[PDB]
Structure 1
Amino acid sequence: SAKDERAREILRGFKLNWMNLRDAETGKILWQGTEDLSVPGVEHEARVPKKILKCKAVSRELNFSSTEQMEKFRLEQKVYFKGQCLEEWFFEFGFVIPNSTNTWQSLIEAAPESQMMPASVLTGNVIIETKFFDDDLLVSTSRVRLFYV
Structure 2
Amino acid sequence: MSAKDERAREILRGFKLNWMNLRDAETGKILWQGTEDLSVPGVEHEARVPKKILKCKAVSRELNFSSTEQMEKFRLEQKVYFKGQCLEEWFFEFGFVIPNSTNTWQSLIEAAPESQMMPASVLTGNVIIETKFFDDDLLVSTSRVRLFYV
Does the 8 Å CA contact 1:57/1:110 hold for their aligned counterparts? yes
Q: May I ask how many residue pairs the two structures share in their alignment? A: 149
Unaligned runs of 5+ in 2: none
SS in 1 for 2:114: coil
Unaligned runs of 5+ in 1: none
Counterpart Cα distance in 1 of 2:51 and 2:113: 20
Partner of 1:14: 15
Deviates more, 1:106-115 or 1:28-37: 106-115
For the aligned residue pairs, the C-alpha RMSD in angstroms reads: 1.4
Shift of 1:35: 2.3
Counterpart Cα distance in 2 of 1:45 and 1:4: 27
Counterpart Cα distance in 2 of 1:131 and 1:112: 27
The C-alpha deviation readout for 1:101-149, integer Å capped at 9, x for no partner, is: 1111111123458722111111100011111100011101101101101
Shift of 1:50: 0.5
Does the 8 Å CA contact 1:17/1:35 hold for their aligned counterparts? no
SS in 1 for 2:116: coil
| TM-score (normalised: structure 1) | 0.95
SS in 1 for 2:118: coil
Does the 8 Å CA contact 1:16/1:35 hold for their aligned counterparts? no
Counterpart Cα distance in 2 of 1:104 and 1:114: 30
Shift of 1:26: 1.9
What percentage of aligned pairs have identical amino acids?
A: 100
Shift of 1:36: 1.3
Matches within 5 A, 1:98-137: 98-111=99-112, 115-137=116-138
| TM-score (normalised: structure 2) | 0.94
Superposed structure 1 runs of 4+ greater than 6 Å apart: none
